Amino acid sequence: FMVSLPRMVYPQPKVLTPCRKDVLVVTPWLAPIVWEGTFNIDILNEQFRLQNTTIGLTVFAIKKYVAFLKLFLETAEKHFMVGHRVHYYVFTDQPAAVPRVTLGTGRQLSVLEVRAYKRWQDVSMRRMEMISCERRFLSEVDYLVCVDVDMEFRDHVGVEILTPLFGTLHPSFYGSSREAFTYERRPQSQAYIPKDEGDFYYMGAFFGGSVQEVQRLTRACHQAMMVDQANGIEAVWHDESHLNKYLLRHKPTKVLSPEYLWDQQLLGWPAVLRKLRFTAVPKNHQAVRNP
Ligand SMILES: O=c1ccn([C@@H]2O[C@H](COP(=O)(O)OP(=O)(O)O)[C@@H](O)[C@H]2O)c(=O)[nH]1
Numbered sequence: 567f568m569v570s571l572p573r574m575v576y577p578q579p580k581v582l583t584p585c586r587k588d589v590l591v592v593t594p595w596l597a598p599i600v601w602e603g604t605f606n607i608d609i610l611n612e613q614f615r616l617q618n619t620t621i622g623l624t625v626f627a628i629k630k631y632v633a634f635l636k637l638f639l640e641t642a643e644k645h646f647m648v649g650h651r652v653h654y655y656v657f658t659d660q661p662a663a664v665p666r667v668t669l670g671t672g673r674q675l676s677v678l679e680v681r682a683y684k685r686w687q688d689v690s691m692r693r694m695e696m697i698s699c700e701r702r703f704l705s706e707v708d709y710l711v712c713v714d715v716d717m718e719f720r721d722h723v724g725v726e727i728l729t730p731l732f733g734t735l736h737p738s739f740y741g742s743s744r745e746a747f748t749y750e751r752r753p754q755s756q757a758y759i760p761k762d763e764g765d766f767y768y769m770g771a772f773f774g775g776s777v778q779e780v781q782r783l784t785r786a787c788h789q790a791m792m793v794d795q796a797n798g799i800e801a802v803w804h805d806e807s808h809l810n811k812y813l814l815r816h817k818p819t820k821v822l823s824p825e826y827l828w829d830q831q832l833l834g835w836p837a838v839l840r841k842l843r844f845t846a847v848p849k850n851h852q853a854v855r856n857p
């Protein structure tokens with residue numbers, strides 16, 4: 567049951583005046599695409615605080631990637647769901663390497679020890695298995711957000727993202743035609759998507775939803791990866807290829823714009839991005855991914 571909102575004074579939405587004319591703000595299946603200017607965060611914060619929403623955030627920090635936790639967590643404290651209840655779940659092979667980060671009230675951090683796989687592909691792919699923990703999350707949080715660790719928050723990331731199931735536009739592909747997307751193109755893979763299909767190219771580094779929908783998605787991607795492995799095939803972009811196939815066949819109920827996953831070193835600051843909210847931390851793939 568949802569109680570009434572209180573009285574609020576804010577600018578009237580004007581029907582004959584779009585919030586944004588330069589971008590698509592709704593998908594053809596009627597899911598909002600979340601850009602700055604499309605939401606009044608005061609209304610959304612009221613709606614979500616009246617439900618006492620708890621948001622879980624999963625992040626894997628395996629092997630050398632424990633070096634990224636301190637900045638990840640400290641900037642998450644400044645920008646991620648401030649005001650709301652947050653439960654961080656840090657999955658790591660080195661619990662003693664997790665930094666002691668000071669948290670705001672109503673926020674908590676659990677360390678979950680897991681095994682480390684040797685190949686960075688397997689570390690990244692096996693997040694889906696590891697996330698799909700199911701009983702714990704159902705009891706502790708309302709939504710789950712699943713992100714890469716090699717990142718920092720630079721601006722607000724809040725309840726405007728929450729919905730039963732979301733993906734995020736990949737920042738290198740948001741202006742690309744579908745034939746250029748780097749979907750898995752071999753029909754022998756469970757992740758396969760033909761050249762005339764596909765809505766968007768979603769990035770593996772930021773997806774989420776209600777616990778039930780996120781467990782559905784990670785269970786389906788893990789089972790699809792297992793099928794591929796048994797068939798001796800590994801999709802071209804690993805978990806990201808599987809996430810893409812899942813979100814093609816199960817349309818997300820919101821899509822985040824590239825505000826929410828950006829790489830300023832590689833892509834700069836285009837005018838279409840009014841805010842850069844969650845951004846890549848520069849790293850040397852070869853070095854950090856190997857002993
Ligand atoms: O040795 C590794 C390799 C990957 N990851 C996790 O897998 C995610 C995806 O890998 P990565 O960020 O290397 O992919 P990229 O963004 O560079 O394509 C990382 O953010 C970490 O959460 C990890 O913890 N240790």
Ligand SMILES: OC[C@H]1O[C@@H](O)[C@H](O)[C@@H](O)[C@H]1O
Nearest residue numbers: 736738747748769770803806
């Ligand atoms: O083409 C897909 C790839 O695009 C890259 O820019 C990104 O670093 C990879 O992780 C993968 O998403």
Ligand SMILES: [Mn+2]
Nearest residue numbers: 714715716771
């Ligand atoms: Mn990453």
